[PDB]
């Protein structure tokens, strides 16, 4: 996270760190959506361009963490991957359209003050919360600037951007399955996701029921917090029909 602050304790009980077995390291970030499933971006698990095609027997998931590097005994929880599901129409060859994937945990994970599931929006909730101007939240142990690292989870609030504005900040092709956020060049403000925040959750709390909803997945960017450039996220709700498909079918 570029230009953030340290996550307050338990502030994001749904944040999940994607960990590599060997060599031990941080691959990406993700979110907890129930004791058995975790959500993340699809290029964190598969990306031919870099010869990436991880198998469940290659990585673990650390839930309820705060310290990036320390093993947080009696707080965080490490679970093993049962099975991995990547959206079938995930286009990595071009613009990472449908950058999303689901992780089925080997065994349920006990909730606590540091581990709790985030809500997924509904057509209605998405309808009234997903609007330019409104701010959302992004969390992770990703880089602080382009090119050190955070010692503790980082938090940042960002305002969503209008379709046109997002469209015109890049040469890359934007699809409806994605939206962008970030402060405008002249709003005179800085902040963004960065290396390692991938899969990260972009959330907002409905002022109606006071609950937090994950509206998007930290998907891709062109640098971190560059003027004129915006950060892109996987439009969660627009793909929830698929999520529900794999979940209710393959156990829940």
């Amino acid at each position: 996270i570029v230009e953030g602050s340290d996550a307050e304790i338990g502030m994001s009980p749904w944040q999940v760190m994607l960990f590599r077995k060997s060599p031990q390291e941080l691959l990406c970030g993700a979110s907890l959506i129930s004791d058995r499933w975790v959500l993340t971006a699809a290029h964190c698990l598969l990306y031919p361009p870099w010869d990436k095609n991880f198998t469940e027997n290659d990585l673990l998931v650390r839930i309820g963490k705060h310290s990036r590097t320390r093993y947080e005994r009696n707080i965080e929880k490490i679970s093993m991957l049962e099975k991995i599901y990547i959206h079938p129409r995930y286009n990595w060859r071009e613009n990472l359209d449908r950058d999303i994937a689901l992780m089925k945990l080997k065994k349920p994970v006990a909730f606590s003050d540091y581990i709790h599931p985030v809500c997924l929006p509904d057509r209605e909730t998405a309808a009234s919360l997903l609007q330019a101007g409104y701010k959302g939240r992004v969390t992770g142990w990703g880089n602080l600037k382009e090119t050190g690292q955070p010692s503790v989870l980082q938090v940042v609030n960002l305002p969503i951007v209008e379709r046109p504005v997002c469209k015109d900040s890049t040469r890359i092709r934007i699809t409806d399955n994605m939206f962008c956020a970030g402060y405008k060049p002249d709003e005179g403000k800085r902040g963004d996701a960065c290396e390692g925040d991938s899969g990260g959750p972009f959330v907002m709390k409905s002022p109606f029921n006071n609950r937090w909803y994950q509206m998007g997945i930290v998907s891709w960017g062109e640098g971190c917090a560059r003027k004129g450039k915006y950060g892109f996220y996987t439009h969660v709700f627009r793909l929830k029909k698929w999520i529900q498909k794999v979940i209710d079918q393959f156990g829940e």
């Binding site: 304790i9 985030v118 409104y134 701010k135 002022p207 006071n210």
Partner: peptide, 28 residues
Amino acid sequence: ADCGLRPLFEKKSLEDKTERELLESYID
């Protein structure tokens, strides 16, 4: 039916350092 409800804040009837900013972006 308990989601998006944090044990250390909502359930505890407390807010974090900046959730205000968010809630304020709606109002305008």
